[PDB]
Amino acid sequence: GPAVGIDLGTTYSCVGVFQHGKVEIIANDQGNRTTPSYVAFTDTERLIGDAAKNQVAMNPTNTVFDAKRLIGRRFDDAVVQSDMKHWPFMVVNDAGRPKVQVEYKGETKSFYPEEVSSMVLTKMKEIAEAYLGKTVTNAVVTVPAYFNDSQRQATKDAGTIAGLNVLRIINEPTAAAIAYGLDKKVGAERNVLIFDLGGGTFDVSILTIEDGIFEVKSTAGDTHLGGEDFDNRMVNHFIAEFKRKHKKDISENKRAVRRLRTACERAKRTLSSSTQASIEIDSLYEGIDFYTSITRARFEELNADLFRGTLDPVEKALRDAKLDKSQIHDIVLVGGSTRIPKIQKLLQDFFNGKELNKSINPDEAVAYGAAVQAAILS
Numbered sequence: 087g088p089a090v091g092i093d094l095g096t097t098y099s100c101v102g103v104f105q106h107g108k109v110e111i112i113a114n115d116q117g118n119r120t121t122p123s124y125v126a127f128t129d130t131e132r133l134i135g136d137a138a139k140n141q142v143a144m145n146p147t148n149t150v151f152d153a154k155r156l157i158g159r160r161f162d163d164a165v166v167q168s169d170m171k172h173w174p175f176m177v178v179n180d181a182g183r184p185k186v187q188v189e190y191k192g193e194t195k196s197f198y199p200e201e202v203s204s205m206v207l208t209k210m211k212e213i214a215e216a217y218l219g220k221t222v223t224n225a226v227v228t229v230p231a232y233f234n235d236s237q238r239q240a241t242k243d244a245g246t247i248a249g250l251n252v253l254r255i256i257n258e259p260t261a262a263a264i265a266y267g268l269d270k271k272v273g274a275e276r277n278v279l280i281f282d283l284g285g286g287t288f289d290v291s292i293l294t295i296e297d298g299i300f301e302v303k304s305t306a307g308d309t310h311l312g313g314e315d316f317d318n319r320m321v322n323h324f325i326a327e328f329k330r331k332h333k334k335d336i337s338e339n340k341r342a343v344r345r346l347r348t349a350c351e352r353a354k355r356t357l358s359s360s361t362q363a364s365i366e367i368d369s370l371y372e373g374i375d376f377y378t379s380i381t382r383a384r385f386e387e388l389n390a391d392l393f394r395g396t397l398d399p400v401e402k403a404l405r406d407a408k409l410d411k412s413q414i415h416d417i418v419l420v421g422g423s424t425r426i427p428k429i430q431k432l433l434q435d436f437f438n439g440k441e442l443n444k445s446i447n448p449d450e451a452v453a454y455g456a457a458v459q460a461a462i463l464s
């Protein structure tokens with residue numbers, strides 16, 4: 087091709103390419119190394135990635151996201167029925183198969199989850215092509231270790247529809263391990279723990295690797311725990327603050343809340359590198375600007391319980407894998423949320439000081455490994 091590796095994430099997607107013994111994580115048109123798994127429909131155009139997420143606050147009903155939560159599933163599934171209650175866009179039943187329904191160019195249209203995902207993949211494909219200056223066809227796409235045959239098939243279909251020849255569908259934790267060269271043959275078997283906290287899901291996977299062969303020993307986590315939940319805690323904190331300072335409740339103004347969420351998300355990222363962050367929103371509500379700040383300590387307290395709770399699935403995974411902490415040879419951080427210092431501290435403390443593999447941006451680790459594997463398969 088060269089072939090590329092793509093992490094089609096629940097909230098963010100990332101594409102990499104292995105060239106000259108090195109993996110290049112490819113930045114998009116806006117210079118971002120990861121791209122929102124968002125697609126929006128308007129009276130005149132279809133928006134994808136950054137362009138789509140950048141307008142989610144004003145077009146909530148026609149901006150689709152979380153397509154990965156529906157992919158390969160049946161409409162009657164309990165989880166699908168539960169999730170629908172939280173999404174601002176409509177999900178309809180087409181012969182027992184879920185489809186997202188939106189308005190596009192003034193007409194009602196519906197798309198299968200794989201179609202929405204094919205759009206995101208098309209964007210990743212184009213991002214790679216812009217960088218390489220060549221047509222990209224072959225790719226390795228990743229999926230959660232718990233995905234079944236249907237979910238895997240639908241994900242592969244998303245690739246095909248996007249014009250990609252999916253060389254193989256591999257597990258996200260395995261891709262992360264490959265990124266660190268943990269697939270290399272060293273004689274005896276090794277136990278690796280993948281701690282993956284993204285924007286919407288938390289996955290803990292214990293892999294046993296021997297002779298380059300991976301075995302998923304156990305998996306644990308929470309499909310409804312991620313960075314967005316941390317943003318939410320910050321959002322509530324600031325709604326209360328605005329209310330005290332202006333005796334005005336912004337809760338019912340959907341756009342105001344979404345804009346505050348965006349400001350919180352960015353402030354949160356800054357708190358991973360600094361101990362304080364500034365929030366400066368213009369015309370948040372009724373023309374009132376909201377300029378304030380938040381400390382890392384404050385951010386940690388607001389999420390104390392959620393952070394600490396990530397250790398329960400780690401213990402469960404170890405138990406199911408029938409392994410004690412000391413039997414874990416490597417701990418790999420995956421997901422943008424693992425960049426939070428308090429999380430790293432909790433995990434390291436739990437593992438009695440053991441160092442964490444975190445040199446590769448956690449939110450790029452899966453695509454990194456996928457790119458390596460893609461090169462191998464080509």
Ligand SMILES: Nc1ncnc2c1ncn2[C@@H]1O[C@H](COP(=O)(O)OP(=O)(O)O)[C@@H](O)[C@H]1O
Pocket residue numbers: 094095096097098099120283284285286287312313314351354355356358420421422423424425426448449450
């Ligand atoms: N520096 C950072 N500090 C804290 N959270 C971050 C940072 N960078 C990204 N994130 C969070 O990571 C989450 C996205 O995770 P990512 O692994 O990129 O995607 P996905 O959720 O699709 O797997 C978002 O909640 C985002 O706010």
Ligand SMILES: [Cl-]
Pocket residue numbers: 114115116135136213
């Ligand atoms: Cl782009």
Ligand SMILES: [Cl-]
Pocket residue numbers: 431432
């Ligand atoms: Cl602590």
Ligand SMILES: [K+]
Pocket residue numbers: 093094095096097098099100284449
């Ligand atoms: K991702």
Ligand SMILES: [K+]
Pocket residue numbers: 282283284285287288289421
């Ligand atoms: K995850």
Ligand SMILES: [Mg+2]
Pocket residue numbers: 095096284421
């Ligand atoms: Mg992820």
